[PDB]
Homo-oligomer: A and B are copies of this chain.
């Protein structure tokens, strides 16, 4: 539900992190989905006109200018320290590592004028009560 109406969007499979599922083919079975994207400032006011403090508008309104798939690269389980980059992609050990870095994450909080909107959906635990009550009229 965005802007009062239901919307539907396809999610970029390079921009969705599906955590804590059980060899399930279904994405609905996951416990924790993080969606990163680069939204325009106009799209965040279309969606969050209703919850963004006047202080938070001045965060959008104090942005330097514009810039505009190299968001930024992470490498976990690095075997070594020797990284090679001057054109903008990171080159590694030949067989120990990836050997090259094609963007693996959306690290910078603003690219172009576009802001960065990280959405986290997660299943937490809620304590409830199960109550056994008898029907007044019959014994149910």
| Secondary structure of the A contact surface, majority rule | loop
Kindly report how many copies of this chain are found in the complex they form together.
5
Could you say which of B20, B30, B31, B114 contacts A22, with CB atoms under 8 Å apart? B114
- Identify which of residues 1-51 in chain A touch chain B, using a CB-to-CB cut-off of 8 Å: 12, 19-24, 29-31, 37-43
Task: Say whether A131 faces chain B, with CB atoms less than 8 Å apart.
Answer: no
Task: Say whether A101 faces chain B, with CB atoms less than 8 Å apart.
Answer: no
- Identify which of residues 89-140 in chain A touch chain B, using a CB-to-CB cut-off of 8 Å: 112-114
Task: Say whether A59 faces chain B, with CB atoms less than 8 Å apart.
Answer: no
Q: Is the CB of B23 within 8 A of A31?
A: no
Q: Which B residue sits closest to A12, measured CB to CB?
A: B23
Q: Is the CB of A113 within 8 A of B40?
A: no
A29-B43, A31-B42, A42-B31 known; A114 vs B37 contact (CB < 8 Å): no
Q: Is the CB of A31 within 8 A of B20?
A: no
Q: Is the CB of B19 within 8 A of A66?
A: yes
Can you spell out 14 A-B residue pairs with CB atoms less than 8 angstroms apart?
A12-B23, A19-B112, A20-B40, A20-B66, A20-B112, A20-B113, A20-B114, A22-B114, A23-B37, A23-B38, A29-B40, A29-B43, A31-B42, A31-B113
